[PDB]
Amino acid sequence: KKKIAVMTSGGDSPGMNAAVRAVVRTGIHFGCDVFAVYEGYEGLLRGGKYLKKMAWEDVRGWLSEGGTLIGTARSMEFRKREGRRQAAGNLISQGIDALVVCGGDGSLTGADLFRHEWPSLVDELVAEGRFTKEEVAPYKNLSIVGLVGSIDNDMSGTDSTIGAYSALERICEMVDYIDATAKSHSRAFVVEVMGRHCGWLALMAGIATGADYIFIPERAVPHGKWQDELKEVCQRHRSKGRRNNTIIVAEGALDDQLNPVTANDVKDALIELGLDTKVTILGHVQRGGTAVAHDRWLATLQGVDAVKAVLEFTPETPSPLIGILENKIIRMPLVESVKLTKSVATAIENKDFDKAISLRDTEFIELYENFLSTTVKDDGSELLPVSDRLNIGIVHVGAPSAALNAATRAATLYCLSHGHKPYAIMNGFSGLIQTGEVKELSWIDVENWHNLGGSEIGTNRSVASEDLGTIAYYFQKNKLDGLIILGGFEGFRSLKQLRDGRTQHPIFNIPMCLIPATVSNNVPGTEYSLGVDTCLNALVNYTDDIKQSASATRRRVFVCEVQGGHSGYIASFTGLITGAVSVYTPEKKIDLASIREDITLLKENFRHDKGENRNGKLLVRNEQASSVYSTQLLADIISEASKGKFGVRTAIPGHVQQGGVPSSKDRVTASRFAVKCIKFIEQWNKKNEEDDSAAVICVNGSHVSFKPIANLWENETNVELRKGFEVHWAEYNKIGDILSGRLKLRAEVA
Amino acid sequence: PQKAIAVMTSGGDAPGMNSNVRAIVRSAIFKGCRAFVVMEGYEGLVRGGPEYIKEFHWEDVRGWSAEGGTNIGTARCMEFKKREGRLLGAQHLIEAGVDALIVCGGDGSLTGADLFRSEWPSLIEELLKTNRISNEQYERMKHLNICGTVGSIDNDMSTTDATIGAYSALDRICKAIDYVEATANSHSRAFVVEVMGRNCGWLALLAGIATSADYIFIPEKPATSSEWQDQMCDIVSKHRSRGKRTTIVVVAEGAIAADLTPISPSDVHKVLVDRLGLDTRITTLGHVQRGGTAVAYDRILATLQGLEAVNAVLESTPDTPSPLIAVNENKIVRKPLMESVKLTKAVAEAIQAKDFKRAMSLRDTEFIEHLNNFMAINSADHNEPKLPKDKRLKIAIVNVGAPAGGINSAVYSMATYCMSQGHRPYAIYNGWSGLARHESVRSLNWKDMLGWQSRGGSEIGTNRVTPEEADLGMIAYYFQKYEFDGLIIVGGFEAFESLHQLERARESYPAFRIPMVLIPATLSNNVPGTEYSLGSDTALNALMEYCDVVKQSASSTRGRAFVVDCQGGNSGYLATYASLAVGAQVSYVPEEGISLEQLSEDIEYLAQSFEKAEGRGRFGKLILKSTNASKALSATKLAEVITAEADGRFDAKPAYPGHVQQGGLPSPIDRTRATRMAIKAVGFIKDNQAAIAEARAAEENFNADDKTISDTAAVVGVKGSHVVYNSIRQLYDYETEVSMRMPKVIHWQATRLIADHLVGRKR
Amino acid sequence: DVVKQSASSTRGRAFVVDCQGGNSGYLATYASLAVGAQVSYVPEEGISLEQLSEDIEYLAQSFEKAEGRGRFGKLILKSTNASKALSATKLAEVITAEADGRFDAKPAY
Numbered sequence A: 001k002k003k004i005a006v007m008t009s010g011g012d013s014p015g016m017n018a019a020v021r022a023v024v025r026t027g028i029h030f031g032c033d034v035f036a037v038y039e040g041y042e043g044l045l046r047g048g049k050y051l052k053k054m055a056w057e058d059v060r061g062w063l064s065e066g067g068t069l070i071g072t073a074r075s076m077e078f079r080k081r082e083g084r085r086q087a088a089g090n091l092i093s094q095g096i097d098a099l100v101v102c103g104g105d106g107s108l109t110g111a112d113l114f115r116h117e118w119p120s121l122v123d124e125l126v127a128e129g130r131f132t133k134e135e136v137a138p139y140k141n142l143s144i145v146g147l148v149g150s151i152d153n154d155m156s157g158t159d160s161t162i163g164a165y166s167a168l169e170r171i172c173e174m175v176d177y178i179d180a181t182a183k184s185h186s187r188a189f190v191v192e193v194m195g196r197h198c199g200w201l202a203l204m205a206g207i208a209t210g211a212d213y214i215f216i217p218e219r220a221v222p223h224g225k226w227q228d229e230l231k232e233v234c235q236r237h238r239s240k241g242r243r244n245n246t247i248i249v250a251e252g253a254l255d256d257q258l259n260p261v262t263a264n265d266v267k268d269a270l271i272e273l274g275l276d277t278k279v280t281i282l283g284h285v286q287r288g289g290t291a292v293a294h295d296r297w298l299a300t301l302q303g304v305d306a307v308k309a310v311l312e313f314t315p316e317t318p319s320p321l322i323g324i325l326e327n328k329i330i331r332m333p334l335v336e337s338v339k340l341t342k343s344v345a346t347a348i349e350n351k352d353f354d355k356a357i358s359l360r361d362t363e364f365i366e367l368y369e370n371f372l373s374t375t376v377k378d379d380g381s382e383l384l385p386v387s388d389r390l391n392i393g394i395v396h397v398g399a400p401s402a403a404l405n406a407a408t409r410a411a412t413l414y415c416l417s418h419g420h421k422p423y424a425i426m427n428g429f430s431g432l433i434q435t436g437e438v439k440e441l442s443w444i445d446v447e448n449w450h451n452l453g454g455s456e457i458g459t460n461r462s463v464a465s466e467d468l469g470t471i472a473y474y475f476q477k478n479k480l481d482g483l484i485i486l487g488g489f490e491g492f493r494s495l496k497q498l499r500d501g502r503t504q505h506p507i508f509n510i511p512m513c514l515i516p517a518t519v520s521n522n523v524p525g526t527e528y529s530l531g532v533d534t535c536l537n538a539l540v541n542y543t544d545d546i547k548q549s550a551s552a553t554r555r556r557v558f559v560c561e562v563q564g565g566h567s568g569y570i571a572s573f574t575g576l577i578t579g580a581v582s583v584y585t586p587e588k589k590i591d592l593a594s595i596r597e598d599i600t601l602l603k604e605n606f607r608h609d610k611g612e613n614r615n616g617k618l619l620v621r622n623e624q625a626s627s628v629y630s631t632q633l634l635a636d637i638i639s640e641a642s643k644g645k646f647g648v649r650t651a652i653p654g655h656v657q658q659g660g661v662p663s664s665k666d667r668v669t670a671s672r673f674a675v676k677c678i679k680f681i682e683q684w685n686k687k688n689e690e691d692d693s694a695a696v697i698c699v700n701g702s703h704v705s706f707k708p709i710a711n712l713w714e715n716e717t718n719v720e721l722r723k724g725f726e727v728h729w730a731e732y733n734k735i736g737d738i739l740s741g742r743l744k745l746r747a748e749v750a
Numbered sequence B: 001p002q003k004a005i006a007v008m009t010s011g012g013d014a015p016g017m018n019s020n021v022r023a024i025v026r027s028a029i030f031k032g033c034r035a036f037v038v039m040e041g042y043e044g045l046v047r048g049g050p051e052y053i054k055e056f057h058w059e060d061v062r063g064w065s066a067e068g069g070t071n072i073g074t075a076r077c078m079e080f081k082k083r084e085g086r087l088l089g090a091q092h093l094i095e096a097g098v099d100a101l102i103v104c105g106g107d108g109s110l111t112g113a114d115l116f117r118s119e120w121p122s123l124i125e126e127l128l129k130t131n132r133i134s135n136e137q138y139e140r141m142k143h144l145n146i147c148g149t150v151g152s153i154d155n156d157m158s159t160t161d162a163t164i165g166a167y168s169a170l171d172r173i174c175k176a177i178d179y180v181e182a183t184a185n186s187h188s189r190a191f192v193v194e195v196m197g198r199n200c201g202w203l204a205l206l207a208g209i210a211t212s213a214d215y216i217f218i219p220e221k222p223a224t225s226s227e228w229q230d231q232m233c234d235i236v237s238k239h240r241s242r243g244k245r246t247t248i249v250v251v252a253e254g255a256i257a258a259d260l261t262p263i264s265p266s267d268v269h270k271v272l273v274d275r276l277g278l279d280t281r282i283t284t285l286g287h288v289q290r291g292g293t294a295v296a297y298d299r300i301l302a303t304l305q306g307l308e309a310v311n312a313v314l315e316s317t318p319d320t321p322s323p324l325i326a327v328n329e330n331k332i333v334r335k336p337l338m339e340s341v342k343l344t345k346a347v348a349e350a351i352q353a354k355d356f357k358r359a360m361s362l363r364d365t366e367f368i369e370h371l372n373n374f375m376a377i378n379s380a381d382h383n384e385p386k387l388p389k390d391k392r393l394k395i396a397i398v399n400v401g402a403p404a405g406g407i408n409s410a411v412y413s414m415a416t417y418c419m420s421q422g423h424r425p426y427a428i429y430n431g432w433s434g435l436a437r438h439e440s441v442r443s444l445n446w447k448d449m450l451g452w453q454s455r456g457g458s459e460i461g462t463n464r465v466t467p468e469e470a471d472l473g474m475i476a477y478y479f480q481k482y483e484f485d486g487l488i489i490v491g492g493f494e495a496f497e498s499l500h501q502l503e504r505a506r507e508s509y510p511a512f513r514i515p516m517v518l519i520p521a522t523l524s525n526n527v528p529g530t531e532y533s534l535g536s537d538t539a540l541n542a543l544m545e546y547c548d549v550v551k552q553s554a555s556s557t558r559g560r561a562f563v564v565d566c567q568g569g570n571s572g573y574l575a576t577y578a579s580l581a582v583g584a585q586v587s588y589v590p591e592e593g594i595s596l597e598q599l600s601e602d603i604e605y606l607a608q609s610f611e612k613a614e615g616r617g618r619f620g621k622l623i624l625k626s627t628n629a630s631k632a633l634s635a636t637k638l639a640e641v642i643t644a645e646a647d648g649r650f651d652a653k654p655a656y657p658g659h660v661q662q663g664g665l666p667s668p669i670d671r672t673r674a675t676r677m678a679i680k681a682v683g684f685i686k687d688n689q690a691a692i693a694e695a696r697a698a699e700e701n702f703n704a705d706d707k708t709i710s711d712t713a714a715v716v717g718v719k720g721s722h723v724v725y726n727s728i729r730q731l732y733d734y735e736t737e738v739s740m741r742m743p744k745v746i747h748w749q750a751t752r753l754i755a756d757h758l759v760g761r762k763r
Numbered sequence C: 001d002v003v004k005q006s007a008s009s010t011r012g013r014a015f016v017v018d019c020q021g022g023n024s025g026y027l028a029t030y031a032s033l034a035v036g037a038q039v040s041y042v043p044e045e046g047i048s049l050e051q052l053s054e055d056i057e058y059l060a061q062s063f064e065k066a067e068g069r070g071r072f073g074k075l076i077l078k079s080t081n082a083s084k085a086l087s088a089t090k091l092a093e094v095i096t097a098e099a100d101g102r103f104d105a106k107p108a109y
């Protein structure tokens, strides 16, 4: 009987639709009834009609829809208790006693004042005609769950707000365009980005676009001296060969004295230095567009937890706000987070920026530090180590990823910062062995690599064991003190190989670390290889288009084959943010039994359709899912069963999954990880005046660390399926199996 | 005694300059000249010797067709204004042995080139009378030959239909508005999008048409002062009150009122807020409009013009007026630099003298048509104005074949245009099978079609079932029942066949005794009667981008080629242009097949390429292969054979972009061109009521096979921005190879050659 | 006859024999009857995955009951048009997989 209402208030953000769609279906699945609330609070006020019972198919396709399909208006009337009581009547009228609000920090607050004031408003209705005490009985207490939908990611408490990464992506897209023209006229562009009073967006975009400088509130610039620091930086970079400058300025940018720092303030300064300067205010392009893989993922999961939290509500449980903390979804006291975020301003008013900055997301300070050491400290100033400076080699081992260059770049700049000499081992190991080609990288060489996909120095799957000796020969010839391996399983296999080779080759005792890089995310020990996000998005854009092609021709299924080798992670994640009715992974058995339950779900599902227009369905099958049942056999076996009721087609994105340009997430992670590795090399190099010096930089639920290659090469499926032993997505899957519509179709068939 | 040509980009950069530079460099080396690139525009000429006037080699422009801006740069010319600058310029050119100069840029930059040319004799004389240049040199090159290539996103150079970069800018614009639209729809807001274009309104107009803006403010139709506030407020109000949650007002950066005073975004913002009182925001796209990689059209356009630009300077003489390459009716042509710039200066004047119709005529071959079309579809049914007095018919529209970018635009445009005329538009959902099996006729309501102008897929649905397969009877029946005066079929070769069937079903079922017309649509461009089916440009871009990404991959591994399976059935159109746009090394088409001999040579040529390439960084190679280019060898098998034949020297992998080839959101070209074809189809319907009508009397022996009645069943085609009409009978019986679903004569075998030359491939 | 003798020699093996006849199951049918084919697929019937699964189980048990005995080879005659998706070759592969070590199948053309 439980009815639930979802509303989307405040500024819209990419992913809200994804969020709503989850709440609806997760609710319907658990027997509840879900109601949409149009135009936000306004519609809540207006009651009836502006409030609607949602069907399962009412949200089909919402995973790839911009803004919010149930709108978001501002309501004055709600500001008065009459309005609030008004609304409360509307909900009680429908038998609704649970409200799921998804939106800006504001809406989230007001949503609490409502729960804490409902019983009171309930009395009034019992009195002044409206409702009997009897009717208003079961609908006595309000259940309230908040979801933060915002591109500012300014909600202290949760690591990421729905839509923040999408907007980020949008910024990068626009800055990437600008780069072309800026480069031509050797100009400088001051780009202004949204963010309200939060510089997360600017800070990310800063790192992701190879910016010369950024401006964020959480770090008010030297009230009177910043224009020189800036000119200094730009000038220096330009002398090193940079043709254009790019400065990212946040909306909330300000200095020591809380005086706002303006795009034009910045522009003027640069004009003063004599540079052809322009200002661009991206504006709302940062709010449109569909949700990137991260937001679709984030919004779908958080939406599912909001329903579960609602069903778990109790009289005394306080208002929960669904968030994310160790890349796992968590619930937190809404009132707390609103205060902690409210307090951020407080510290800014009292020029206590340090206090402020610590209130931002888990990784904020780190990022900012990364940005400086990679862009401003190339002054010779900052850490230009005595003479325990090092020769660091860099190789790409594996199929191309999209973050190799960006990462190689971060590492090169950092190295140069400290006075280390970064070497590029051309064309992987096979290349070294065949040619001994090792070129020293210069500041200008690594220019614009931050958004260049592929591998500028060459990358291939050849492993170290192809001639471990000649390799060692050159590592020595080149006096290398450390080695960075950028790559996938072959890289991981190679690192192991080199660790072992230590006994027979003294030179391999230099520190050696692997930065996993592969679209597959099949490198043991870490939950995130570089280039993964880029892949997932390429697959989104890909499926979004063929999804639309199936919807056009009506009644049609696409069998889409995804990469990832013998690791269905990509397959699973894709299936979830795609609504795939069936996801065939190597982890999940593919026998005639399964295929049939699949044909079933399909046929059944198709008996309905009618709505057409946006009704195309798809299957996500992993590259190695089944040696016997190939993407084609699967597609044909399925057609033949359809018996003209519906059509089937195959989709094999293929190598585009490697991407063209790295996504903003990959561009930033590459910088983090690259530097963390140069550091790790430094540390070990000094710590030697024991295999722990040969590690893999890993991320496990948000925590990044180094893991000795040996202990790890027993979490592997080595000379077999080449993949990390475990699987951390089996949860995605079962959820996915509900929203997708699978089990629902399973039921009808019985 | 090898001569030399040199290129420089001057003025504002524009997407496609690199493609231009690349072709010029290659075409020159191909013809046997030495190629030279001038860095940083004219400044480059003042400064000199290598570094600024650097000799380029084949491999130097490798990959350029996929990069933004100008890799050879462009700077503001200071020194060149003075004579010592212009003198140094001549010296440096002469010192480099360059007496052939090609410049790509805006008209301002073009004229500067001409003047330099005329001033050349004068300069070399002074140069001689003071040394600087030997006597041997003086004689050797006493004349400067130049040619212009106009690159600009504004599309405001009068003698050419499209400036290099224009459509790329248009793409950037429509992409930003599509983003803005989604947040706008969330808050039912109103946005004033300030667009570039300097003094031209080409971008604002096309954008508005493409994005279905509620109102555009262009400088060629100032018509206002007090009019625009009412003009706009009225149609906006009608739109919003009737459903549309958003309000998008495109404002040319250089818009003005009839009194020549400027109209700013603010000006429009205020009115929207004050008068109509709605939440409004201003958006100024700025330079994103200048960035990005060149759109397929620009790459292909700049690539061809570049080639011709070399031909031009190579055949210019001291008496030939300075040339400039342009496009007229999708045809690459030469135009006199002076007349061209003179004709352009004209527009400014005409505008300065309130004669707006004159300025409007000086724009591109179809500027005015778009404006009228916008107006219609924009008003469409919101103003009873029903242009025609009850001469308004009930017309039906339907989709047949594969979906394709722009079909929804066609529908939307045809519907809303009907509404401005008074005609009642009816949509037949899911083609013939949807008609016969479910009487799927529906009335197209303006509100129900919000957004359709720019949606991919097919809102009304489409399949490949032909009329005969769905039972002609049931068809004719429902037809008669709803009383359709005319039919408008949008689709591919199945839609062709349909037309054909319905027409030769005329006598037998008098319900088909109406005018019909087909708007071709298929990314394959295999429908006879046209040079451009709808959906084509969208697919070409889809494929091009895919290829860019794939080649990047190949370049990463070094010594690797990709065989990309392409679409287009028996038509090599897609593979050809895609190939030209991404500089594919090899391309296999259905019309030619893949002879084992050719395959062998290509494999050797490829082989050497990689050897000569050594381990270098951007030498990946692509082989585009239309599937039908060989039933025996698939992209997969092809890769295997090449890899084996390669013999370790290099390898090859397959790539199946597959259905992404249909693209996602239709391209500005596909969108605007759809509404153009749609409107001229409605026009064909009305203009052909007469004939078959005064005969559509009793199904008596008054119905026959006379050109006059058959000729009401035609395909709206296009011959270079033209628009032709041809009886389905003419096409189907003499110009079709129906057995293979495509025209009997292929119209692009010539460019296949150009492509080979640009990349150095043989037979 | 010759192919089955082969299959009987290896023990625990079945052959999927591609048969002619276009859309007519005449040849596969009578051939099947004449050699005692265990299974036979024809154009007029097709090969539904369900039927395929049972045939594979039935076959499976056949060999189990047969133990290692000497003349238990099995034949599956399949008219080519019995399935455009599953060729004699792919069919053997699927059966062998579904068999799961219990017995295998090879194609015959």
Ligand SMILES: O=P(O)(O)OC[C@H]1O[C@@](CO)(OP(=O)(O)O)[C@@H](O)[C@@H]1O
Pocket: A398, A399, A400, A461, A488, A489, A490, A518, A519, A520, A521, A522, A563, A564, A565, A566, A623, A655, A658, B653
């Ligand atoms: O280019 P090749 O070597 O064929 O690799 C194809 C794909 O296989 C994959 C797995 O799908 O390799 P890997 O497992 O090493 O990550 C992808 O990374 C790679 O794009």
Ligand SMILES: O=P(O)(O)OC[C@H]1O[C@@](CO)(OP(=O)(O)O)[C@@H](O)[C@@H]1O
Pocket: A649, B401, B402, B492, B493, B522, B523, B524, B525, B526, B567, B568, B569, B570, B659, B661, B662
């Ligand atoms: O999925 P189906 O409907 O078979 O069509 C696939 C492709 O075939 C094509 C040709 O590749 O059809 P068509 O020849 O009519 O142009 C494409 O338009 C379409 O994308």
Ligand SMILES: O=P(O)(O)OC[C@H]1O[C@@](CO)(OP(=O)(O)O)[C@@H](O)[C@@H]1O
Pocket: C020, C021, C022, C023
């Ligand atoms: O050599 P082709 O022309 O492929 O014919 C092969 C077989 O085709 C068959 C069918 O198997 O033709 P048909 O269907 O007409 O009976 C046989 O008659 C013939 O042996």
Ligand SMILES: O=P(O)(O)OC[C@H]1O[C@](O)(CO)[C@@H](O)[C@@H]1O
Pocket: A010, A011, A012, A104, A150, A151, A152, A194, A195, A196, A251, A287
């Ligand atoms: O669109 P509005 O109404 O101007 O609100 C804009 C503000 O909304 C936000 O997107 C936050 O929701 C900020 O980034 C921005 O400054």
Ligand SMILES: O=P(O)(O)OC[C@H]1O[C@](O)(CO)[C@@H](O)[C@@H]1O
Pocket: B012, B106, B152, B153, B154, B196, B197, B198, B253, B290
């Ligand atoms: O980038 P600049 O130097 O400000 O010039 C901008 C002008 O250039 C143009 O792109 C024309 O070249 C116009 O669209 C725009 O108004």
